[PDB]
Amino acid sequence: RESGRKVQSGNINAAKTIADIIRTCLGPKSMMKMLLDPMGGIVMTNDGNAILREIQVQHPAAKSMIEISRTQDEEVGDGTTSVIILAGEMLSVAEHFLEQQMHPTVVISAYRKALDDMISTLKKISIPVDISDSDMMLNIINSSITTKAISRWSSLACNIALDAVKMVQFEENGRKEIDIKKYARVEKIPGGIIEDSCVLRGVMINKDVTHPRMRRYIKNPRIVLLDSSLEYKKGESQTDIEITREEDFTRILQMEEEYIQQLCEDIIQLKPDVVITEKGISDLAQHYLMRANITAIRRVRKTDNNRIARACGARIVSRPEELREDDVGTGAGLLEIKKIGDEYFTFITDCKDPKACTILLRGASKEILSEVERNLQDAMQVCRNVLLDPQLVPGGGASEMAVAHALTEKSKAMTGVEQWPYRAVAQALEVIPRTLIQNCGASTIRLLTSLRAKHTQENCETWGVNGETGTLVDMKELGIWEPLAVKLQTYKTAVETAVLLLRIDDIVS
Amino acid sequence: AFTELQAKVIDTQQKVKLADIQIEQLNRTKKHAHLTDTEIMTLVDETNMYEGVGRMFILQSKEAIHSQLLEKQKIAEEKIKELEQKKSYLERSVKEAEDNIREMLMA
Amino acid sequence: GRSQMESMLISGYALNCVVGSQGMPKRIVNAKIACLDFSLQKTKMKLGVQVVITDPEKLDQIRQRE
Amino acid sequence: NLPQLEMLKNQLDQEVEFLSTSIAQLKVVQTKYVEAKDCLNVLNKSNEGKELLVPLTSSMYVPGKLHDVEHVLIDVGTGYYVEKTAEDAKDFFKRKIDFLTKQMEKIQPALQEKHAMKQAVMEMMSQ
């Protein structure tokens, strides 16, 4: 039970401090807040998503801030800090005034037009990419890794991100939307080195299949994904009574044989060696296949088989009758039990569809690998974000100072009370520049007013202050870049986010 | 894995045994079932022949008493096949699971 | 898809369906319909129609005759 | 100490003996219901009026003329008898077998389980 202006305050109130301390933590140049547990447990992070947690949370809109944050933590995970900045910016500025000017409403609307102007300006301020040139992509990843200051192994993982994620990218609604991630498969591996890893075709099966009787290598036998229903039928097509006695053992187990084979001969109809048996797994099912000298890999996940559905690019087959390569094991394909470290790894490569690879990771060991993987995970996603979005923007204040002018130019032209949000919208761009001016550790009011001028003539197209260069700069020469969507994705959120709590005057239990 | 491949060699080796003497018993039961026919067949017609199974012996005519009793022969002759069929199948099974024990050991 | 202006009321029901991919007739006039909420699929019959094996073909025909 | 492991071995030996006996006997008792079931098919067949030689007493067998093939007994209740139709009698024979069947049945699950646990004690024995 909470009300109105006090909500509206608690909106501005909480969302203020919500938007805040992690901006000290923001920037490649940053300030890590300390976090103390009531027991005395200490934490040092630049991660708001992490910072969101140990702090005791009460304000349910702060919980809701954690929501769009986690919601964004789901999407990128980076900028979850940066998304809640601007809503904090947004909710702070227009709300109290314009609610004391009596409305969420004109505030609500104008962020539609706060959104589009930049969305427009985004397509203007962001420039297309070569996803064709991975180096044109690499610098982004070279840029993506280094705000949290990780380079060492990532410098390679940068490239390896480029490689698979363009391949792990095959997806179409017919408008060809590519979100596809789960295709990309990663491998914890002991030994090798962080500077040695790769992407192997199909989907390499690492996690739950070490299984040594897969044989080892499949030259061109098929791998078989069973939504069969390979389960032995104790009768003709059915499962007869159990075996409590000698008579039920002879007759029933015999008919259990046929249904395995007749399907496994349908499996043989696509000629495998490896059959990874998921539905209809039977102790006779593998044994027959093992009697068939068909290695039947059981006690297995359909997630593996979904990895294997993306390992051969295939589907999994409920059809008992007439099992096919294109049914399961699409394409010639491979299957190989590989030891990277000594861990057995099934590698099912050569998906029937091209753009087939999945990321092998070697560190000097699992951990220093996990160093790669975690950062590669960021590296690899920026790809499918650049692969998502083949436009990208000179960052910092360039990203920031661009639209406010058009926005103010709107507010000036729009000259409503919607102009007031476009004023409230204008400088909210510049807070991370303030943080960037924090990042350099300089005088913001100057650099703002300075960068304000930098948009008066240059129009801050490439010109922000970059706290890490310290100065108002071209962000193209300087090379500050993100795929446009990510900018918007950070930008889209806070609008709706602010607009979200812009709706709430009422908490009620 | 091996356990289920161990489980079939045990379930076979126990149940493969009985059918082997089971055919033997019926080969015997075929005999008197046939021979109990001859003894009353020895009397060329006897209507004070009593065909009866248990305690009661009801009066009947030896004829159908024999018609029963070559079948009783046959019936007691019959399952020996089944009881040999049950026999021969299991020895083939014990080595199969014994194999996937060993080959999956080797793989 | 197509134009945003080509949205049309259409005669009866344009299916959301899997069209017949076997070379299905793409027009059957005046359709007597079987609307199936029931999947046709298949099941394994250890012995289908006939018996005789005159061919290794005929070995596979029995369970195929279903 | 030393006798306790010696104790439970041949202990579980006998449960095998007991249950194998009980299923054997519950293999026995079922067999006479179909006997009561089948002897009625014969008496229907030949006819009421055929000479029946039934036991009289020890070594004694007594004759009689068959009558009332439709009048045939089911022994049930504590001390009670229901003579039943030629159809009905054969039914509860079948019934009380099946009553005995799972009665007979679960004995071997009980039978076979007691030996390996003797073995398990015999395993620890030579251990």
Swiss-Prot record, chain A:
Mg(2+) binds at D78. The modification Phosphoserine is found at S155, S228, S229, S237. Keywords: Acetylation, ATP-binding, Chaperone, Cytoplasm, Disease variant, Disulfide bond, Hydrolase, Intellectual disability, Isopeptide bond, Nucleotide-binding, Phosphoprotein, Ubl conjugation. ATP binds at G27, G79, T80, T81, G396, G467, E482. GO terms for cellular component: cell body; chaperonin-containing T-complex; cytoskeleton; cytosol; extracellular exosome; microtubule; zona pellucida receptor complex. The keyword Signal does not apply. Its EC number is 3.6.1.-. It catalyses: ATP + H2O = ADP + phosphate + H(+). This is T-complex protein 1 subunit gamma. Disulfide bonds join C351-C357. GO terms for biological process: binding of sperm to zona pellucida; chaperone mediated protein folding independent of cofactor; chaperone-mediated protein folding; positive regulation of protein localization to Cajal body; positive regulation of telomerase RNA localization to Cajal body; positive regulation of telomere maintenance via telomerase; protein folding; protein stabilization. The modification N6-acetyllysine is found at K207. There is a cross-link at K233, K234, K366 (Glycyl lysine isopeptide (Lys-Gly) (interchain with G-Cter in SUMO2)). Component of the chaperonin-containing T-complex (TRiC), a hexadecamer composed of two identical back-to-back stacked rings enclosing a protein folding chamber. Each ring is made up of eight different subunits: TCP1/CCT1, CCT2, CCT3, CCT4, CCT5, CCT6A/CCT6, CCT7, CCT8. Interacts with PACRG. Interacts with DNAAF4. Interacts with DLEC1. It comes from the Eukaryota. Belongs to the TCP-1 chaperonin family. Coiled coil: none annotated. It is found in: Cytoplasm. The modification Phosphotyrosine is found at Y232. Its main location: cytoplasm.
From Swiss-Prot, chain B:
The keyword Protein transport does not apply. One of its GO terms (cellular component) is prefoldin complex. Pfam families: Prefoldin_2 (PF01920). GO terms for biological process: chaperone-mediated protein folding; negative regulation of amyloid fibril formation; protein folding. One of its GO terms (molecular function) is unfolded protein binding. Keywords: Acetylation, Chaperone. It comes from the Eukaryota. Binds specifically to cytosolic chaperonin (c-CPN) and transfers target proteins to it. Binds to nascent polypeptide chain and promotes folding in an environment in which there are many competing pathways for nonnative proteins. Belongs to the prefoldin subunit beta family. Heterohexamer of two PFD-alpha type and four PFD-beta type subunits. This is Prefoldin subunit 1. The gene is PFDN1.
Swiss-Prot record, chain C:
It is found in: Cytoplasm, Cytosol; Cytoplasm, Cytoskeleton, Microtubule organizing center, Centrosome. Signal peptide: none annotated. Coiled coil: none annotated. It is linked to Intellectual developmental disorder with polymicrogyria and seizures: An autosomal dominant neurologic disorder characterized by a broad phenotypic spectrum. Main clinical features are developmental delay of varying severity, intellectual disability, seizures, and polymicrogyria. Additional variable features are non-specific pyramidal or cerebellar signs, and visual impairment. Component of the chaperonin-containing T-complex (TRiC), a molecular chaperone complex that assists the folding of actin, tubulin and other proteins upon ATP hydrolysis. The TRiC complex mediates the folding of WRAP53/TCAB1, thereby regulating telomere maintenance. As part of the TRiC complex may play a role in the assembly of BBSome, a complex involved in ciliogenesis regulating transports vesicles to the cilia. Belongs to the TCP-1 chaperonin family. This is T-complex protein 1 subunit alpha. It comes from Homo sapiens (Human). The gene is TCP1. The chain holds residues 202 to 267 of 556 of the full protein.
From Swiss-Prot, chain D:
The modification N6-acetyllysine is found at K32. Highly expressed in pancreas and skeletal muscle and moderately in other tissues. The modification Phosphoserine is found at S46. GO terms for molecular function: amyloid-beta binding; transcription corepressor activity; unfolded protein binding. GO terms for biological process: chaperone-mediated protein folding; negative regulation of amyloid fibril formation; negative regulation of canonical Wnt signaling pathway; negative regulation of DNA-templated transcription; protein folding; regulation of DNA-templated transcription; retina development in camera-type eye; RNA polymerase I assembly. GO terms for cellular component: cytoplasm; cytosol; intermediate filament cytoskeleton; nucleus; prefoldin complex. Transmembrane segments: none annotated. Keywords: Acetylation, Chaperone, Cytoplasm, Nucleus, Phosphoprotein. Binds specifically to cytosolic chaperonin (c-CPN) and transfers target proteins to it. Binds to nascent polypeptide chain and promotes folding in an environment in which there are many competing pathways for nonnative proteins. Represses the transcriptional activity of MYC. Heterohexamer of two PFD-alpha type and four PFD-beta type subunits. Binds to MYC; interacts with its N-terminal domain. Belongs to the prefoldin subunit alpha family. This is Prefoldin subunit 5. It comes from Homo sapiens. The gene is PFDN5. The chain holds residues 11 to 137 of 154 of the full protein.
